[PDB]
Design an enzyme around this catalytic site. Structure first.
Site, PDB file in Angstrom:
ATOM      1  N   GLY A 162       0.797  -1.215   0.000  1.00 46.22           N
ATOM      2  CA  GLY A 162       0.000   0.000   0.000  1.00 46.22           C
ATOM      3  C   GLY A 162       0.831   1.267   0.000  1.00 46.22           C
ATOM      4  O   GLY A 162       0.400   2.268  -0.571  1.00 46.22           O
ATOM      5  N   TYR A 169      -9.217  -0.352  -3.963  1.00 40.15           N
ATOM      6  CA  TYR A 169     -10.320  -0.050  -3.043  1.00 40.15           C
ATOM      7  C   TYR A 169     -11.665  -0.127  -3.762  1.00 40.15           C
ATOM      8  O   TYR A 169     -11.989   0.722  -4.594  1.00 40.15           O
ATOM      9  CB  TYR A 169     -10.162   1.352  -2.430  1.00 40.15           C
ATOM     10  CG  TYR A 169      -8.973   1.497  -1.513  1.00 40.15           C
ATOM     11  CD1 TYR A 169      -7.726   1.861  -2.008  1.00 40.15           C
ATOM     12  CD2 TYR A 169      -9.100   1.308  -0.140  1.00 40.15           C
ATOM     13  CE1 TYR A 169      -6.628   2.009  -1.161  1.00 40.15           C
ATOM     14  CE2 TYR A 169      -8.008   1.440   0.714  1.00 40.15           C
ATOM     15  CZ  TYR A 169      -6.777   1.795   0.199  1.00 40.15           C
ATOM     16  OH  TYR A 169      -5.720   1.917   1.060  1.00 40.15           O
ATOM     17  N   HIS A 180      -7.225  11.514   8.419  1.00 42.55           N
ATOM     18  CA  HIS A 180      -5.857  11.027   8.535  1.00 42.55           C
ATOM     19  C   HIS A 180      -4.932  11.755   7.581  1.00 42.55           C
ATOM     20  O   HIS A 180      -5.389  12.375   6.630  1.00 42.55           O
ATOM     21  CB  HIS A 180      -5.804   9.522   8.193  1.00 42.55           C
ATOM     22  CG  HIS A 180      -5.985   9.210   6.725  1.00 42.55           C
ATOM     23  ND1 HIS A 180      -7.240   9.143   6.145  1.00 42.55           N
ATOM     24  CD2 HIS A 180      -5.054   8.944   5.772  1.00 42.55           C
ATOM     25  CE1 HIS A 180      -7.034   8.849   4.871  1.00 42.55           C
ATOM     26  NE2 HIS A 180      -5.734   8.729   4.598  1.00 42.55           N
ATOM     27  N   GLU A 182      -1.017  10.667   5.544  1.00 43.92           N
ATOM     28  CA  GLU A 182      -0.398   9.429   5.057  1.00 43.92           C
ATOM     29  C   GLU A 182       0.654   8.889   6.026  1.00 43.92           C
ATOM     30  O   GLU A 182       1.142   9.622   6.886  1.00 43.92           O
ATOM     31  CB  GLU A 182       0.223   9.656   3.664  1.00 43.92           C
ATOM     32  CG  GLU A 182      -0.775  10.056   2.589  1.00 43.92           C
ATOM     33  CD  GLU A 182      -1.887   9.054   2.429  1.00 43.92           C
ATOM     34  OE1 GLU A 182      -1.588   7.909   2.029  1.00 43.92           O
ATOM     35  OE2 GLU A 182      -3.033   9.378   2.807  1.00 43.92           O
ATOM     36  N   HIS A 268      -7.133  14.355   5.315  1.00 41.20           N
ATOM     37  CA  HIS A 268      -8.287  14.111   4.451  1.00 41.20           C
ATOM     38  C   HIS A 268      -9.197  13.049   5.024  1.00 41.20           C
ATOM     39  O   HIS A 268      -8.794  12.244   5.867  1.00 41.20           O
ATOM     40  CB  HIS A 268      -7.881  13.809   2.976  1.00 41.20           C
ATOM     41  CG  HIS A 268      -6.809  12.753   2.834  1.00 41.20           C
ATOM     42  ND1 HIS A 268      -5.478  13.016   3.153  1.00 41.20           N
ATOM     43  CD2 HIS A 268      -6.908  11.467   2.425  1.00 41.20           C
ATOM     44  CE1 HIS A 268      -4.826  11.887   2.949  1.00 41.20           C
ATOM     45  NE2 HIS A 268      -5.646  10.922   2.517  1.00 41.20           N
ATOM     46  N   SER A 280      -4.538   3.163  -5.307  1.00 42.60           N
ATOM     47  CA  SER A 280      -3.777   4.082  -4.467  1.00 42.60           C
ATOM     48  C   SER A 280      -2.383   3.574  -4.119  1.00 42.60           C
ATOM     49  O   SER A 280      -2.157   2.358  -4.084  1.00 42.60           O
ATOM     50  CB  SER A 280      -4.567   4.322  -3.181  1.00 42.60           C
ATOM     51  OG  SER A 280      -4.151   5.511  -2.541  1.00 42.60           O
TER      52      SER A 280
HETATM   53  N1  LIG Z   1     -10.633   4.799   0.660  1.00 45.75           N
HETATM   54  C1  LIG Z   1     -10.048   5.667  -0.167  1.00 45.75           C
HETATM   55  O1  LIG Z   1     -10.419   5.839  -1.344  1.00 45.75           O
HETATM   56  C2  LIG Z   1      -8.883   6.453   0.364  1.00 45.75           C
HETATM   57  C3  LIG Z   1      -8.680   7.793   0.064  1.00 45.75           C
HETATM   58  C4  LIG Z   1      -7.643   8.461   0.689  1.00 45.75           C
HETATM   59  N2  LIG Z   1      -6.802   7.885   1.567  1.00 45.75           N
HETATM   60  C5  LIG Z   1      -6.996   6.582   1.830  1.00 45.75           C
HETATM   61  C6  LIG Z   1      -6.059   5.960   2.775  1.00 45.75           C
HETATM   62  C7  LIG Z   1      -6.334   4.845   3.500  1.00 45.75           C
HETATM   63  S1  LIG Z   1      -5.029   4.417   4.522  1.00 45.75           S
HETATM   64  C8  LIG Z   1      -4.145   5.789   3.906  1.00 45.75           C
HETATM   65  N3  LIG Z   1      -2.912   6.065   4.350  1.00 45.75           N
HETATM   66  N4  LIG Z   1      -4.790   6.504   3.008  1.00 45.75           N
HETATM   67  C9  LIG Z   1      -8.016   5.831   1.254  1.00 45.75           C
HETATM   68 ZN   LIG Z   2      -5.030   8.686   2.323  1.00 48.84          ZN
END
Ligand SMILES: NC(=O)c1ccnc(-c2csc(N)n2)c1
Ligand SMILES: [Zn+2]
Ligand SMILES: [Zn+2]
Length: 341
Positions: A162, A169, A180, A182, A268, A280
Site C-alpha cells: 500500500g 479499493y 488522517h 499518510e 483528508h 492508491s
Molecule cells: N478509501 C479511499 O479511497 C482512500 C482515500 C484516501 N486515503 C486513503 C487511505 C487509506 S489508509 C491511507 N494512508 N490513506 C483511502
Molecule cells: Zn489517504
C-alpha cells in the site's frame, strides 16, 4: 493560493509523461497549500482497455464499516468478513438495502451521508493488493511511479504493501475513509478506475495542528493512549463540526477517470457515492524528507537515514545528534519546482 483552496489541473499528453515534474509544477502553482489536488488526465490516455473481466477478482478481507456516534463526531469500527469476489461485492452494492439514494445536488447526498452513516453499515472492499493498469502503461502508473520513495526498496529491499506497492479499493454507497494524513506524512495518488464518485474533505497542512487539537479535546481517552491516534483512521468529523470550531477546510468530488494527489501532512477524509474502484499508493519529493524526519507516529516506520545521507549530507551529523531544529514552512513548494519559479 492564499485561500488554500483545492485546485484542478488539466495536463496535455506531453505534460503528463513526466510524473515527478508535473507534481513539482503543481507545487509551483500553490496546489500543496490545500493538502489535496485534482488532476484530470489527457483524453487520449487510458490505463486499461475495459473493466468487464474483473468479476472473479478476489477481495480477501472485506470490512463491514460500523459507525458509532452523534452530533457530527463519530468512531468507525471494521469488522472483517469472509473473502468475496468483485461480482459478489457489486451485487451487494446495487441491492435495494445498500444502493445509492436518489439525489439532485451533491449537497443532498452529503446531507444523506451525515444523517445516515450510523445506520445500515456498508461493506468496504479495501486494501486489496493489486493494480488495474495494463503492463505497457508508462504514464502515471501507480505501481511504478519512479519517485525518490524507490530508495526504500532499492537500498533496503523492504516492501510496505500500500505504501510502496499499489492497493485497490472497492467502494459502495456510504463507505468511508476517516480523518488522517499518510504514513510517514508521505504524498499519495488516487485514481478512480470506474463507477460512482468519491467525495473528499481536506484541511490545509498549515491548519493541520488545529484539527489534531480539536480531535484530542473530543477523544481525551484515545489521545492519552496514542501520540497520533488519528492514524488509527477511525475518527469521522462532519464539515459542520469543522465549521463550528473554525477549522478551515475544502471539499471536492472525484469522478471516474480522475486523479487526486494528497500532500505531506494534508488531512483528508471522505465517502463513496456508490459502486466504484480506486487505485492508491504513496510517493515522495525532496520536500517530503523534512516531514518524514518530523512525523509523529502511532505509539509503518520508514528509516530516514538513507534519505538524510543522500539529500541532506550537511545536516546528517546534526540530525543524528538530534540538534536539527528545522521548522517546516507548509506554503513552500518542493525544490524541484525551481524551474517553474
Ligand atoms: N478509501 C479511499 O479511497 C482512500 C482515500 C484516501 N486515503 C486513503 C487511505 C487509506 S489508509 C491511507 N494512508 N490513506 C483511502
Ligand atoms: Zn489517504
Ligand atoms: Zn496507537
Amino acid at each position: 493560493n492564499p485561500s488554500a483552496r483545492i485546485m484542478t489541473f488539466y495536463p496535455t499528453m506531453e505534460e503528463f509523461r513526466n510524473f515527478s515534474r508535473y507534481i513539482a509544477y503543481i507545487e509551483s502553482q500553490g496546489a500543496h497549500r490545500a493538502g489535496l489536488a485534482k488532476v484530470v488526465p489527457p483524453k487520449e490516455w487510458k490505463p486499461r482497455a475495459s473493466y468487464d473481466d474483473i468479476d472473479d477478482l478476489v477481495i480477501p478481507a472485506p470490512i463491514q464499516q460500523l459507525v458509532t456516534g452523534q452530533s457530527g463526531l463519530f468512531t468507525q469500527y471494521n469488522i472483517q468478513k469472509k473473502a468475496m469476489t468483485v461480482r459478489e461485492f457489486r451485487k451487494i452494492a446495487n441491492s435495494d438495502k445498500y444502493c445509492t439514494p436518489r439525489y439532485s445536488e451533491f449537497e443532498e447526498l452529503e446531507r444523506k451521508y451525515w444523517k445516515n452513516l450510523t445506520f445500515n453499515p456498508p461493506i468496504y472492499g479495501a486494501d486489496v493488493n493489486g493494480t488495474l493498469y495494463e503492463k505497457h502503461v508508462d504514464e502515471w502508473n501507480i505501481g511504478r511511479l519512479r519517485t525518490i520513495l524507490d530508495l526504500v526498496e532499492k537500498e533496503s529491499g523492504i516492501t510496505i504493501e500500500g505504501v510502496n506497492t499499489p492497493y485497490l479499493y472497492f467502494g459502495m454507497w456510504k463507505t468511508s475513509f476517516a480523518w488522517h494524513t499518510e504514513d510517514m506524512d508521505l504524498y499519495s495518488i488516487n485514481y478512480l478506475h470506474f463507477g460512482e464518485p468519491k467525495s473528499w474533505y481536506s484541511v490545509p497542512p498549515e491548519h493541520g495542528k488545529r484539527l489534531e487539537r480539536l480531535a484530542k479535546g473530543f477523544f481525551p481517552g484515545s489521545a492519552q493512549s496514542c501520540e497520533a491516534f488519528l492514524r488509527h483512521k477511525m475518527t469521522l468529523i462532519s464539515p459542520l463540526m469543522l465549521k463550528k470550531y473554525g477549522i478551515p477546510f475544502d471539499k471536492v468530488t472525484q469522478e471516474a477517470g480522475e486523479f487526486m494527489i494528497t500532500f505531506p501532512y494534508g488531512y483528508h477524509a471522505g465517502f463513496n457515492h456508490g459502486f466504484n474502484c480506486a487505485e492508491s499508493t504513496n510517493f515522495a519529493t525532496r520536500r517530503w524528507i523534512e516531514y518524514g524526519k518530523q512525523a509523529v507516529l502511532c505509539s509503518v516506520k520508514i528509516s530516514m537515514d538513507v534519505f538524510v545521507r543522500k539529500f541532506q549530507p550537511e545536516r546528517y551529523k546534526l540530525w543524528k545528534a538530534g540538534k536539527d531544529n528545522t521548522v517546516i514552512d507548509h506554503t513552500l513548494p518542493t525544490p524541484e519546482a525551481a524551474e517553474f519559479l
